[PDB]
Amino acid sequence: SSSLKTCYKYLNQTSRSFAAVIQALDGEMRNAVCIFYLVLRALDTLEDDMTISVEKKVPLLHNFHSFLYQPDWRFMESKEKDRQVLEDFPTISLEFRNLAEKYQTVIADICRRMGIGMAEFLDKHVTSEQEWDKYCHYVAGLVGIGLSRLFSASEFEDPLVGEDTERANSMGLFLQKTNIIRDYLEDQQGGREFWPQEVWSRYVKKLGDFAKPENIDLAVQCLNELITNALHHIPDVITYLSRLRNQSVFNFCAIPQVMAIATLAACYNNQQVFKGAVKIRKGQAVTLMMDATNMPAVKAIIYQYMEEIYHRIPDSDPSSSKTRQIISTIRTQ
Amino acid sequence: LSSSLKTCYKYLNQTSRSFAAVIQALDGEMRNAVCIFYLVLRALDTLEDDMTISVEKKVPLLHNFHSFLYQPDWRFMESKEKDRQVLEDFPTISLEFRNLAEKYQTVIADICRRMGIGMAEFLDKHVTSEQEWDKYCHYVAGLVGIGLSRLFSASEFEDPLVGEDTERANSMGLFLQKTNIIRDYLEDQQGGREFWPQEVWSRYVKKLGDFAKPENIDLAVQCLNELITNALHHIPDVITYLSRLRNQSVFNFCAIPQVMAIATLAACYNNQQVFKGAVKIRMMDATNMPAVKAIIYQYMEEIYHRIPDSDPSSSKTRQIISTIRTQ
Amino acid sequence: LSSSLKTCYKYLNQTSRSFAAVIQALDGEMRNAVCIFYLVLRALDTLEDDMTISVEKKVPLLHNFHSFLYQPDWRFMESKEKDRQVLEDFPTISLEFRNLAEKYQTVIADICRRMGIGMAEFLDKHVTSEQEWDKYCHYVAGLVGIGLSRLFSASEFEDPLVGEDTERANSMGLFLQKTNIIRDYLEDQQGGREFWPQEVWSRYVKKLGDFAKPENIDLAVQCLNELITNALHHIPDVITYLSRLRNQSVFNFCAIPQVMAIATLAACYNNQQVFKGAVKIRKGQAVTLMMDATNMPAVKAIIYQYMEEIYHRIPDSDPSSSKTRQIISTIRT
Numbered sequence: 001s002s003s004l005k006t007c008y009k010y011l012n013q014t015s016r017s018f019a020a021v022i023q024a025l026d027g028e029m030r031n032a033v034c035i036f037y038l039v040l041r042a043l044d045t046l047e048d049d050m051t052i053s054v055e056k057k058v059p060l061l062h063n064f065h066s067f068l069y070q071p072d073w074r075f076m077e078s079k080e081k082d083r084q085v086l087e088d089f090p091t092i093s094l095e096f097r098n099l100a101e102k103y104q105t106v107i108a109d110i111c112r113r114m115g116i117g118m119a120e121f122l123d124k125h126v127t128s129e130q131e132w133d134k135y136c137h138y139v140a141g142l143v144g145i146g147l148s149r150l151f152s153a154s155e156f157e158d159p160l161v162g163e164d165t166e167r168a169n170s171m172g173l174f175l176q177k178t179n180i181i182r183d184y185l186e187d188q189q190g191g192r193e194f195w196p197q198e199v200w201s202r203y204v205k206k207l208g209d210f211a212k213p214e215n216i217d218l219a220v221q222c223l224n225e226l227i228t229n230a231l232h233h234i235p236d237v238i239t240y241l242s243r244l245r246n247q248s249v250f251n252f253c254a255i256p257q258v259m260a261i262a263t264l265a266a267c268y269n270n271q272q273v274f275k276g277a278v279k280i281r282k283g284q285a286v287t288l289m290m291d292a293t294n295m296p297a298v299k300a301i302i303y304q305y306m307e308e309i310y311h312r313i314p315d316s317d318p319s320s321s322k323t324r325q326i327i328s329t330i331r332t333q
Numbered sequence: 334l335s336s337s338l339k340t341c342y343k344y345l346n347q348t349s350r351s352f353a354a355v356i357q358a359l360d361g362e363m364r365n366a367v368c369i370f371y372l373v374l375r376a377l378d379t380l381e382d383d384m385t386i387s388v389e390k391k392v393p394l395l396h397n398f399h400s401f402l403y404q405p406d407w408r409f410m411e412s413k414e415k416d417r418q419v420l421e422d423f424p425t426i427s428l429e430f431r432n433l434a435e436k437y438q439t440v441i442a443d444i445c446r447r448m449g450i451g452m453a454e455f456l457d458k459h460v461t462s463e464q465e466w467d468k469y470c471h472y473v474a475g476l477v478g479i480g481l482s483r484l485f486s487a488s489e490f491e492d493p494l495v496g497e498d499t500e501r502a503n504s505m506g507l508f509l510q511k512t513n514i515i516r517d518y519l520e521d522q523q524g525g526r527e528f529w530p531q532e533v534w535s536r537y538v539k540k541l542g543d544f545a546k547p548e549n550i551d552l553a554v555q556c557l558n559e560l561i562t563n564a565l566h567h568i569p570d571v572i573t574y575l576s577r578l579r580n581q582s583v584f585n586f587c588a589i590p591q592v593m594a595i596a597t598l599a600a601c602y603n604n605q606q607v608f609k610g611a612v613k614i615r616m617m618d619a620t621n622m623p624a625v626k627a628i629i630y631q632y633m634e635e636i637y638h639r640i641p642d643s644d645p646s647s648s649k650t651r652q653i654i655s656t657i658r659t660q
Numbered sequence: 661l662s663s664s665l666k667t668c669y670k671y672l673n674q675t676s677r678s679f680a681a682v683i684q685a686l687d688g689e690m691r692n693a694v695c696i697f698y699l700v701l702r703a704l705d706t707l708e709d710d711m712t713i714s715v716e717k718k719v720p721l722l723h724n725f726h727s728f729l730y731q732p733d734w735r736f737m738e739s740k741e742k743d744r745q746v747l748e749d750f751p752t753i754s755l756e757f758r759n760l761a762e763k764y765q766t767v768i769a770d771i772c773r774r775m776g777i778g779m780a781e782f783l784d785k786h787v788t789s790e791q792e793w794d795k796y797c798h799y800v801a802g803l804v805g806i807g808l809s810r811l812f813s814a815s816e817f818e819d820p821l822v823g824e825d826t827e828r829a830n831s832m833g834l835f836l837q838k839t840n841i842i843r844d845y846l847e848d849q850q851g852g853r854e855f856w857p858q859e860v861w862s863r864y865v866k867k868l869g870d871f872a873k874p875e876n877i878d879l880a881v882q883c884l885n886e887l888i889t890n891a892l893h894h895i896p897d898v899i900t901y902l903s904r905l906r907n908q909s910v911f912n913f914c915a916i917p918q919v920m921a922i923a924t925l926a927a928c929y930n931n932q933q934v935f936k937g938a939v940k941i942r943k944g945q946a947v948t949l950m951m952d953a954t955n956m957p958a959v960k961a962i963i964y965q966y967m968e969e970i971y972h973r974i975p976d977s978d979p980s981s982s983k984t985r986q987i988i989s990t991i992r993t
């Protein structure tokens with residue numbers, strides 16, 4: 001199949017982070033996740049493109065899940081860098097239709113719901129923390145849920161993995177919030193705001209005020225609060241990861257979670273989050289002799305990064321009790 | 334959820350930068366049992382270490398420490414040590430100790446009882462012979478090894494053969510203790526504690542504190558190298574002990590500190606820095622036995638390669654390393 | 661224990677910086693078998709490489725080396741090579757060889773005999789065609805892979821299939837040997853050794869020595885790229901071979917050099933420094949930092965990451981562009 005081979009090239013051109021771990025997935029999961037990724041990538045490139053007017057965008061996002069079924073559908077007017085995935089969509093959608101019906105149900109359900117969610121947020125920033133969760137659910141939680149339903153449909157993981165959508169959602173929210181926290185400056189420089197207004201407006205009048213050197217003490221307080229919010233997903237991350245029985249699936253799910261915990265540790269109480277992108281830490285003496293390939297070691301690596309955070313909690317921070325408390329809760333479970 | 338247990342894990346993290354994360358990663362009942370064992374031992378260490386407690390007050394403290402586990406109101410408010418918090422709020426610790434299955438209690442109390450006798454015995458004296466060095470390390474670290482192994486077996490996560498093999502469990506403790514005592518010459522000397530065995534150092538200098546001055550550095554590295562050579566004798570037992578373990582969380586908990594000690598010893602070997610300050614510890618991680626073996630073998634080759642011919646222990650260093658490689 | 665065997669392990673550590681620890685980590689009977697096999701191979705290689713031994717003197721030694729194993733007093737005193745100690749104290753090595761179980765003796769002798777024949781044949785000729793390049797590699801490395809595999813099967817630590825599939829074991833050795841030859845172009849030049857197949861390099865330059873001249877650096881890299889492309893053909897067999905291993909210590913032993921070999925090709929690909937010094941051997945992204953070659957999915961992901969490092973660097977200008985992309989694409993399938 002030249003078609004399937006073109007899918008794998010698109011994956012390597014398009015997924016810096018998951019291309020290799022996706023290709024190491026056992027049996028039927030390999031193609032199903034490869035394709036899942038490519039359709040979400042296409043959806044994202046559409047949602048992403050500021051050149052497409054909302055009048056054209058809303059229908060594109062709503063009906064995307066059905067383009068999956070229309071052999072000749074493609075989109076020729078994208079201005080995004082990943083636009084080949086839209087221009088050669090018939091190739092991706094052919095292989096999609098070539099998957100076991102059970103995987104198509106999952107992929108198409110996620111595209112459908114993602115599309116609806118994306119359309120809702122086209123017109124609005126995030127206000128409340130509840131709304132932060134809603135946004136991350138649509139953009140990342142559903143990816144967690146989708147993947148997790150693919151693992152279970154393949155029988156490489158027990159049915160609980162797909163059934164427990166709350167744990168799957170938590171996996172996505174944790175990476176998504178960590179990315180949003182990490183990228184404050186790069187997003188600000190690009191006219192994009194993802195930090196929840198109900199939170200930042202308690203510190204400054206505009207989100208962009210975090211970029212100014214006189215507001216750094218406030219910016220960091222806000223940072224620490226959001227980081228603390230994000231840590232609440234850790235018990236679910238640990239629960240989810242500890243249920244996995246397949247090595248290829250475990251590598252795929254664990255590695256991004258570990259990287260995210262490390263990022264949060266590097267960001268906590270860090271002024272640098274606001275002068276640029278943040279330098280990830282050296283790794284503690286215990287983490288250095290472990291990688292993220294069995295559950296106990298993952299646990300230990302997460303616990304260690306929790307301590308790197310706990311060690312740095314300064315009493316004058318207004319979230320300090322809260323940050324101590326969640327970490328403390330996680331440490332005790 | 335227990336506010337008492339939350340406090341214990343808080344303490345674990347305050348006092349154990351090194352072991353906390355792997356203790357927390359332990360499967361099932363081992364997690365709480367090892368947490369409590371660690372805190373109880375940390376309380377007992379703190380009493381031992383504290384120089385403001387007169388020997389006559391300290392002896393009963395160490396002797397009777399195991400009984401305090403069963404005295405709900407017992408605590409010590411007089412310590413000035415860094416980890417005093419664990420003695421000052423001992424009731425919270427001993428309460429969580431009493432919530433453990435008896436199976437675990439029996440082991441912890443038994444180790445405390447024996448450790449206390451041992452600690453008290455060495456209060457008055459400095460370590461003389463190598464046999465004595467072993468005895469002291471047996472009491473403060475070998476017993477920990479033995480108690481830990483008995484906890485793994487009692488929990489059923491490890492085979493009964495793990496807890497029954499007390500000799501190799503003891504060697505696991507002796508190796509960490511000796512490495513730490515080798516590494517901390519300088520820290521120990523400027524806090525007025527002597528742990529280097531006298532029958533060894535007294536062949537090089539008149540007072541153990543002489544290794545701290547520049548003009549005795551040659552002799553100092555000589556004695557250092559002799560002590561490291563002694564410590565390496567434990568590595569075979571370490572490999573055998575680790576090879577028996579079948580639980581991955583226990584394996585990580587046991588293996589990582591051993592591999593870290595081996596790295597320390599490799600960094601310290603022939604290294605003058607031991608006497609001038611702290612030492613820089615410079616496709617595999619330590620979570621399966623064949624990888625651990627290879628890491629260990631590599632560190633050994635790093636020692637083998639720096640062996641100076643002139644060094645008094647050179648042949649002996651070569652011998653033990655040769656033995657380990659061929660095993 | 662045996663003082664004889666201790667001497668063997670000293671020699672092992674003197675001669676194999678790379679493999680020693682990993683060989684020492686092998687389970688049970690395999691440890692001494694592979695240690696002794698390595699040393700015997702090392703002694704044979706030393707006879708082969710030593711240019712102070714005339715072809716006429718050398719051939720009969722290569723031919724009879726397999727039988728010297730049963731001559732307790734046999735030693736060689738006239739080598740001036742670095743590892744001459746293994747020839748000079750060969751009786752110690754052959755003593756321990758004769759202490760191996762007989763089923764391991766049979767294997768080691770058989771390989772030594774066939775390697776000797778091969779080595780004799782190439783002592784007087786250079787490598788012409790790619791076919792001839794596989795044959796030479798077969799003789800000096802492919803057979804090592806075959807020998808090792810048969811040791812694995814005879815020990816019952818691996819399935820009988822491992823030893824039987826001689827083709828897949830051959831590809832493991834070919835991949836290493838081709839990688840070393842590719843990496844070592846410059847050191848080999850300065851030593852009067854030529855291993856690049858002439859039917860390949862003669863289509864670029866009149867004399868293999870010209871790649872060392874600054875002027876032809878562009879034609880040089882192009883050959884460098886075509887040979888790399890040739891080596892990449894073995895990777896699917898490497899993956900297949902690795903995928904069959906069930907013993908951890910054996911897996912570790914087999915996977916790690918294959919990974920170091922792919923890492924080396926990635927680094928050498930399109931890299932001009934292959935003709936100025938030794939190539940700065942280097943790391944991937946944080947995911948290869950977050951994994952190590954000790955399980956099959958992790959090795960696949962590591963392989964795929966290095967696969968993409970090469971893919972993204974393929975210049976259109978290059979005459980092998982199309983075949984490099986096709987082989988990589990094949991590996992991704």
Ligand SMILES: CC(C)=CCC/C(C)=C/CC/C(C)=C/CSP(=O)(O)OP(=O)(O)O
Nearest residue numbers: 352356370371374375378379382473474477
């Ligand atoms: C149970 C477990 C998971 C790990 C072992 C950690 C502990 C607390 C072991 C008890 C052995 C010690 C530390 C004895 C006293 S020497 P010292 O270390 O008290 O001397 P120092 O700290 O330098 O004053």
Ligand SMILES: CC(C)=CCC/C(C)=C/CC/C(C)=C\CSP(=O)(O)OP(=O)(O)O
Nearest residue numbers: 018033036037040041044047048139140143
């Ligand atoms: C198969 C697998 C592991 C994962 C799927 C990965 C993909 C392509 C997910 C799409 C998620 C979306 C819509 C955006 C990225 S976060 P954003 O909304 O902040 O950025 P955006 O502006 O939409 O690019």
Ligand SMILES: CC(C)=CCC/C(C)=C\CC/C(C)=C/CSP(=O)(O)OP(=O)(O)O
Nearest residue numbers: 014015016017018140143144168171172253
């Ligand atoms: C249940 C489970 C295992 C996971 C939760 C879902 C996952 C994996 C991700 C959330 C979606 C995101 C943020 C994808 C980025 S893909 P990328 O690397 O292509 O983005 P890039 O454009 O390269 O920065």
Ligand SMILES: CC(C)=CCC/C(C)=C\CC/C(C)=C/CSP(=O)(O)OP(=O)(O)O
Nearest residue numbers: 348349350351474477478505506509510587
């Ligand atoms: C048999 C077996 C599994 C292990 C051997 C027994 C163990 C674990 C330890 C021996 C006691 C020592 C030397 C502890 C280090 S104190 P520390 O390093 O805890 O002090 P720190 O945490 O750095 O404050």
Ligand SMILES: CC(C)=CCC/C(C)=C\CC/C(C)=C/CSP(=O)(O)OP(=O)(O)O
Nearest residue numbers: 675676677678679801804805832833836914
């Ligand atoms: C099937 C399988 C498991 C393996 C394939 C066959 C093998 C192992 C090797 C081929 C020989 C080579 C090129 C060795 C590396 S150089 P070196 O050893 O001289 O480098 P060093 O001297 O050790 O530093």
